[PDB]
Design a protein around this ligand. Sequence first.
Ligand SMILES: Nc1ncnc2c1ncn2[C@@H]1O[C@H](COP(=O)(O)OP(=O)(O)O[C@@H]2O[C@H]([C@@H](O)CO)[C@@H](O)[C@H](O)[C@@H]2O)[C@@H](O)[C@H]1O
Length: 445
Amino acid sequence: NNQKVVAVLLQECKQVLDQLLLEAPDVSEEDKSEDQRCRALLPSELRTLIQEAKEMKWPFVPEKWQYKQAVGPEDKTNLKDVIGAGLQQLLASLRASILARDCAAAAAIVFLVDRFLYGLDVSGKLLQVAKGLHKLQPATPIAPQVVIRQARISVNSGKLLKAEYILSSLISNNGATGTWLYRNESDKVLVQSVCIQIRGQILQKLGMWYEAAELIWASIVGYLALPQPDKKGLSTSLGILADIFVSMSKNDYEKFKNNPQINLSLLKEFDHHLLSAAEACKLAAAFSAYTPLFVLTAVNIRGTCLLSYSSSNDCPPELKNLHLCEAKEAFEIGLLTKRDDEPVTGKQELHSFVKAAFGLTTVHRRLHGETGTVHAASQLCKEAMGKLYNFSTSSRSQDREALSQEVMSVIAQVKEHLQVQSFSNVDDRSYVPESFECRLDKLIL
Ligand SMILES: Nc1ncnc2c1ncn2[C@@H]1O[C@H](COP(=O)(O)OP(=O)(O)O[C@@H]2O[C@H]([C@@H](O)CO)[C@@H](O)[C@H](O)[C@@H]2O)[C@@H](O)[C@H]1O
């Protein structure tokens, strides 16, 4: 599960597809047998997911908690774990399906690993494999999630018009793409809603804060328009909306707030853009209570907003301590997203943990001045930042594992020196306090 290894394997798959383009179809019984074998040795859950993806059951691979309201223990997991555990074998089955010229199945595996590989910043090579599949057998259906993935890397690269042709093609034509078949009409609205969200991100990249916020609101409406509302998308859009609220000026936020078409409770309940942002982050963390990373990012932004507002001249002195305590709670939740000592992978998650440490130390400095524990916690924070940037710059996998473990050890030490106490929740699988009520009805007035 390394970027370089996976990237090289995807390159090999692409080379195989090119060679098959030069060769005439002659699938040997060995090829078919190794295809069936490689798929059969995968765990049952992944075989089911592969068959469902191949059958075009959904345009996105869903999470068990994403569409269910009456959630339970079997729903409170994330596919990152099962996919990450069988990634090597999923790629072996991908190569095997390519050699068997079963491009529909190979595309199904591409669909399955798409999200995890985006986390590894290797979506380009994966999309090269998809293009080779389409070159061999043009009728091979490609999931809208993968097309949108192309849009995503194009936005991340600054190719805004290129991404916008993809997004606009999906939006203006009811999500139609290639030879993909929707089983119901609502999945089209879902694809449209993700594309509209990405339009919001494009306008955010351009600093058109008001219109970006409007598009994000539209994506929220679309997520609510589904038979089962998309809680994951709502969490994402609430976070993006929070960042936009932070970047907005006060006149931007006032113009957005005075638009009656936008029936957001937080828009009419708060008058300061940082407080609206903090509330939007609270809701975003509530809506992804079983995915600790997004809870951590959301509460990080929340704590930053409350820290910034508490020091503002717009904050009444009676509430300064209350908002500082709210920021303290937020950063505490963020640090509590990691329990006991499980490894932490990814520069983003690590960076978010150090961000939570800096936030909590800053809040303590605001509450108790320059105490000794603020100095010790500050030293631990700077150490964690040093090992963090060493991690980000290192190319040796073992150094990255070691620096990650050390950085998390430091994080645990700031947790001890600052007395972060676990919160009470009747849902031991949830990463948010009960105060963070997951209520979709309160989003709307
Ligand atoms: N709840 C969340 N909070 C904060 N950040 C989040 C988040 N969920 C995802 N992210 C970040 O957004 C980036 C793209 O996400 P993805 O899961 O890689 O996209 P995709 O595989 O197409 O899955 C679809 O995502 C839609 C939105 O949530 C994101 O566009 C959902 O509405 C669809 O139902 C579907 O799940 C990435 O950087 C991730 O870390």
